[PDB]
Amino acid sequence: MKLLVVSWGDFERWKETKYRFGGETSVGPSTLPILQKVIKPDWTVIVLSDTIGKDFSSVETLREDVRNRVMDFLDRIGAGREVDVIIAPGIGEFTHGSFRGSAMDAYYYVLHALSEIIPTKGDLEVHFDSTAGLNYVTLLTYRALKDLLGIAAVMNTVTFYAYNSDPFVPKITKELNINTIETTMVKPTPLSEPLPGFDEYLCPYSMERAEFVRLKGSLNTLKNLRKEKKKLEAWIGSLLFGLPLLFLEEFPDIGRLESYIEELAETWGGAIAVNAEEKAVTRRLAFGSGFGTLVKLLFQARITRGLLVEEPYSIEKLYSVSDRLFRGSTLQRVRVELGKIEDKAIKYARKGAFPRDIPLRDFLGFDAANREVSPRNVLAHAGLEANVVEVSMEAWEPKRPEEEAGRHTHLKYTPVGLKKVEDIVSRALKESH
Amino acid sequence: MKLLVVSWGDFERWKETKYRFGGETSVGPSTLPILQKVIKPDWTVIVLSDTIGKDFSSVETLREDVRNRVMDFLDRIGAGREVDVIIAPGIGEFTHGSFRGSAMDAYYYVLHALSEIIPTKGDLEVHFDSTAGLNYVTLLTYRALKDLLGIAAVMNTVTFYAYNSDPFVPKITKELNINTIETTMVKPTPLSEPLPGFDEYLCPYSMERAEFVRLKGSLNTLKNLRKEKKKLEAWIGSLLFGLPLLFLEEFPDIGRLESYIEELAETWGGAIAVNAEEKAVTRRLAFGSGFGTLVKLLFQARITRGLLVEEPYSIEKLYSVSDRLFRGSTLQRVRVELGKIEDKAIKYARKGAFPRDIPLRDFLGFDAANREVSPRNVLAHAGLEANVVEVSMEAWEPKRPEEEAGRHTHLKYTPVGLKKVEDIVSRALKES
Numbered sequence: 044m045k046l047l048v049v050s051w052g053d054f055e056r057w058k059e060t061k062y063r064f065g066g067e068t069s070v071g072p073s074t075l076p077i078l079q080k081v082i083k084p085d086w087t088v089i090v091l092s093d094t095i096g097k098d099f100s101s102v103e104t105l106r107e108d109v110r111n112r113v114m115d116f117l118d119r120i121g122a123g124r125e126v127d128v129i130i131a132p133g134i135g136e137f138t139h140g141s142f143r144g145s146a147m148d149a150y151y152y153v154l155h156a157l158s159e160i161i162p163t164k165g166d167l168e169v170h171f172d173s174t175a176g177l178n179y180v181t182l183l184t185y186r187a188l189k190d191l192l193g194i195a196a197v198m199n200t201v202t203f204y205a206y207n208s209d210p211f212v213p214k215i216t217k218e219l220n221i222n223t224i225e226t227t228m229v230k231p232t233p234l235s236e237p238l239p240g241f242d243e244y245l246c247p248y249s250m251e252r253a254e255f256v257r258l259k260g261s262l263n264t265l266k267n268l269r270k271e272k273k274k275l276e277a278w279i280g281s282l283l284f285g286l287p288l289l290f291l292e293e294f295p296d297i298g299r300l301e302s303y304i305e306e307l308a309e310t311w312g313g314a315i316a317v318n319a320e321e322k323a324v325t326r327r328l329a330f331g332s333g334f335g336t337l338v339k340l341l342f343q344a345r346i347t348r349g350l351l352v353e354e355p356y357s358i359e360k361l362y363s364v365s366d367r368l369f370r371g372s373t374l375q376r377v378r379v380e381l382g383k384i385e386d387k388a389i390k391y392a393r394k395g396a397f398p399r400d401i402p403l404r405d406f407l408g409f410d411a412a413n414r415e416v417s418p419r420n421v422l423a424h425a426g427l428e429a430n431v432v433e434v435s436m437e438a439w440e441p442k443r444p445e446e447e448a449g450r451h452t453h454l455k456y457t458p459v460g461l462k463k464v465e466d467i468v469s470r471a472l473k474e475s476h
Numbered sequence: 477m478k479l480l481v482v483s484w485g486d487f488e489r490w491k492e493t494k495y496r497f498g499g500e501t502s503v504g505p506s507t508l509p510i511l512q513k514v515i516k517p518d519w520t521v522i523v524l525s526d527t528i529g530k531d532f533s534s535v536e537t538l539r540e541d542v543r544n545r546v547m548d549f550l551d552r553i554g555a556g557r558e559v560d561v562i563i564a565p566g567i568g569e570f571t572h573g574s575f576r577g578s579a580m581d582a583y584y585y586v587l588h589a590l591s592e593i594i595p596t597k598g599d600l601e602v603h604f605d606s607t608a609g610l611n612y613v614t615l616l617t618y619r620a621l622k623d624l625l626g627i628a629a630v631m632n633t634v635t636f637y638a639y640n641s642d643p644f645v646p647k648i649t650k651e652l653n654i655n656t657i658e659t660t661m662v663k664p665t666p667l668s669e670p671l672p673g674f675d676e677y678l679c680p681y682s683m684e685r686a687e688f689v690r691l692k693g694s695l696n697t698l699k700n701l702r703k704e705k706k707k708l709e710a711w712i713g714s715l716l717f718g719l720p721l722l723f724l725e726e727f728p729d730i731g732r733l734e735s736y737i738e739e740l741a742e743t744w745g746g747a748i749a750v751n752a753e754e755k756a757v758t759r760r761l762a763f764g765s766g767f768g769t770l771v772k773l774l775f776q777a778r779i780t781r782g783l784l785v786e787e788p789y790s791i792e793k794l795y796s797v798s799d800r801l802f803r804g805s806t807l808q809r810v811r812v813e814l815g816k817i818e819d820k821a822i823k824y825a826r827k828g829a830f831p832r833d834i835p836l837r838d839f840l841g842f843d844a845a846n847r848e849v850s851p852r853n854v855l856a857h858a859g860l861e862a863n864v865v866e867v868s869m870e871a872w873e874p875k876r877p878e879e880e881a882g883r884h885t886h887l888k889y890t891p892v893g894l895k896k897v898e899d900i901v902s903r904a905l906k907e908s
């Protein structure tokens with residue numbers, strides 16, 4: 044999968060010039076044609092500001108006006124129509140009309156937009172062009188792209204190239220070169236934020252206190268997320284800290300996450316006041332960081348959903364999941380911790396013994412010294428702590444028990460144990476933020 | 477410590493307007509005065525492109541010319557004394573001069589300049605105004621800030637705010653708001669890339685390839701890196717993988733790194749041709765990723781220099797280092813691994829036994845036929861692998877050995893063990 048992403052300002056105001064890139068030359072007002080010629084991307088994404096729109100009879104007429112103008116410009120230049128146009132909510136008071144709202148809305152909106160576009164399976168070659176973009180939307184677009192590609196890199200190889208052209212001086216210019224200003228092997232960065240307080244999902248930009256309170260108190264998301272908050276943070280921590288059993292047991296419901304994001308996005312959309320005569324858009328609600336954390340969480344869940352299996356979890360499964368989610372000292376520590384439980388199950392098998400619903404402490408042979416569940420022991424032992432995990436060996440007829448024990452050995456958290464682990468991982472995730 | 481950084485273009489062409497920010501107002505051509513008023517920074521950094529230069533007599537008369545017109549402008553709207561001016565290398569064909577080179581030189585130059593300004597002790601509150609610079613110079617300045625602050629965040633609390641003003645649209649503008657476009661607590665990100673091949677430190681832009689090879693051959697930096705590359709990657713791995721004894725034993729020579737960076741820097745500068753009659757600057761060398769890695773490596777060393785304890789390396793000292801350097805599962809991993817050696821040391825102390833210069837495997841009482849040093853055992857056991865570490869307990873008269881054993885029990889790698897750990901950690905950093 045090759046992806047081309049370009050950040051555009053007022054594309055209509057650009058002058059004709061010549062562009063050098065990768066042994067090709069191009070006449071025209073935009074880099075997109077030559078970019079598409081040289082790179083030959085599988086898909087193109089154009090990101091520009093609302094503030095180019097000149098129709099205020101509705102919000103849907105404003106997006107469609109900007110879209111048509113972009114499609115018309117794609118015909119003017121050699122550009123293909125295989126593209127997604129993200130119309131970002133931009134700020135400023137212009138001659139053709141006024142746009143008020145939180146500046147940060149552009150980031151959350153583009154993050155949301157790209158989280159529905161960037162494929163969640165297979166490798167990713169991403170190309171980002173900033174040659175004639177607005178400074179702040181290009182920063183926020185750049186930021187939103189890197190935040191999702193960081194999560195994508197957990198499961199797949201991701202390569203990021205950025206471009207910018209030589210600056211344009213009028214009539215002095217002859218052939219502007221398109222420079223490569225970044226070539227990056229994107230580092231795997233799983234989500235490492237907790238879900239924030241319920242003030243930080245939607246905030247009031249230009250709205251009376253009581254009307255915001257009503258909208259806020261109308262949201263099913265905030266209500267449902269109050270009692271789900273701990274389980275989701277436990278799941279975020281499972282990737283961050285190397286807890287493969289918690290990853291499987293706490294795997295979130297993608298349907299509910301979709302539902303939470305859809306609702307917050309619809310509410311934000313519904314609160315955009317478009318006054319038709321005086322030519323003015325007011326975004327009466329602002330997106331908060333909690334919206335962003337939800338978009339990243341859903342995306343990470345989509346990226347890792349191929350690993351989830353049904354409830355009996357074998358040692359062999361925990362190995363294969365771990366080898367995909369984890370790297371460096373984290374992966375090697377998880378393999379050593381699982382191995383210790385494996386070597387014990389091999390021993391049990393050679394004696395023709397196959398325990399059922401046995402605490403891991405009783406399985407491994409533990410003193411009656413320490414039954415209290417500590418952060419130290421939960422985080423240092425890949426979450427496979429002896430007082431919270433239950434083991435089951437499914438009886439078989441051994442011949443080569445060293446290779447058969449992992450398939451027949453299953454680990455699960457006790458109802459009480461799971462709740463103790465959720466508290467520790469949730470607290471650890473907030474303490475590291 | 478509070479730090480303001482601004483990305484500036486042709487600051488002279490700026491028209492007078494008024495700005496709002498944090499319940500305050502200000503009238504002037506730039507936002508620096510009101511940002512300074514509301515934020516009250518302890519220090520301010522201005523990043524400019526050198527592409528506003530006009531007098532092409534030499535390199536030092538371009539950076540002179542640009543610096544003059546900046547210091548005049550800072551006095552005109554009172555930006556004060558507490559200001560560093562970074563004149564980054566820009567490219568483009570302009571009305572009063574031509575500037576040819578790698579676009580990415582602006583990143584490596586700003587990265588190098590910021591690495592000398594950002595304080596390496598204490599917490600950091602960083603403010604970044606992107607209002608008005610060259611698109612790509614502002615982007616590379618932002619990237620250069622985040623890359624360095626990520627390393628700072630390993631040891632100190634780091635919060636980063638970004639701003640962009642409402643677009644100045646000259647016919648209709650009455651005032652412009654300074655909008656917060658970012659507010660983030662910066663996540664701790666240790667350096668996590670190996671040192672590249674000796675082609676990726678300085679690269680030819682417009683230099684004949686025969687001349688490059690000649691000058692590449694004359695650099696005492698690349699010859700010294702031949703020896704030290706693997707020892708430096710071992711240290712990079714120590715932070716990333718939680719290997720506290722390797723962090724201390726491989727701790728890099730800050731002075732030596734300064735001089736490597738200084739030689740690549742002034743060799744780059746020395747290859748900038750200035751043609752006064754044609755009015756053309758040409759940067760015939762470009763900085764490579766390896767110059768970037770060295771700058772980040774030197775900064776990470778400065779950030780963590782406080783943790784290089786006096787020898788010998790006691791369990792007590794190793795806990796103290798680890799408690800500062802590691803977080804999450806990595807920290808708890810290291811505490812449990814050091815705890816195993818401590819509990820053993822306590823056992824020995826209670827029996828009036830004080831083993832001297834004994835392999836860790838003998839100290840812990842290991843079986844035979846597990847003498848092979850694996851990646852798995854080096855990385856899973858916080859680098860305290862039983863076949864590469866040597867233990868010494870300095871003899872004492874114990875009273876409460878549970879408290880005393882940690883201070884009197886010292887660990888080092890054997891010379892043979894160290895090179896195996898270097899090979900494994902270097903290899904592991906490359907596969908990453």
Ligand SMILES: Nc1ncnc2c1ncn2[C@@H]1O[C@H](CO)[C@@H](OP(=O)(O)OC[C@@H]2O[C@H](n3cnc4c(N)ncnc43)[C@H]3OP(=O)(O)O[C@H]32)[C@H]1O
Binds near residue numbers: 052053056607642
């Ligand atoms: N006192 C000041 N004097 C002069 N400039 C100031 C001052 N204070 C702040 N600035 C900012 O400094 C940058 C240079 O003037 C400006 O920043 P930015 O607005 O981000 O500039 C980017 C260009 O605005 C252009 N575009 C002009 N029309 C509109 C428009 N109607 N919808 C959105 N963008 C517009 C964009 O089209 P493109 O891609 O050709 O170039 C961009 C100014 O907002």
Ligand SMILES: Nc1ncnc2c1ncn2[C@@H]1O[C@H](CO)[C@@H](OP(=O)(O)OC[C@@H]2O[C@H](n3cnc4c(N)ncnc43)[C@H]3OP(=O)(O)O[C@H]32)[C@H]1O
Binds near residue numbers: 570
């Ligand atoms: N076909 C095209 N038609 C129109 N623009 C194009 C086209 N292709 C590329 N562009 C670029 O797209 C942005 C919008 O026009 C421009 O780049 P941007 O970085 O946004 O430049 C904006 C201003 O150029 C100014 N400044 C002009 N001289 C120099 C200079 N020599 N040293 C530093 N800055 C310069 C900057 O000073 P400030 O802070 O007032 O605002 C910037 C253009 O260079």
Ligand SMILES: Nc1ncnc2c1ncn2[C@@H]1O[C@H](CO)[C@H]2OP(=O)(O)O[C@H]21
Binds near residue numbers: 380407420427
């Ligand atoms: N509370 C605890 N104290 C010490 N070791 C533990 C604890 N919980 C788990 N472990 C060890 O983590 C491994 C995976 O479950 C397993 O190997 P072990 O060393 O036999 O004891 C377990």
Ligand SMILES: Nc1ncnc2c1ncn2[C@@H]1O[C@H](CO)[C@H]2OP(=O)(O)O[C@H]21
Binds near residue numbers: 814840
């Ligand atoms: N090759 C190895 N195989 C198994 N365990 C090891 C090895 N090397 C080190 N360890 C264990 O790492 C800990 C810190 O040295 C220490 O505690 P242990 O579990 O007694 O054995 C050691």
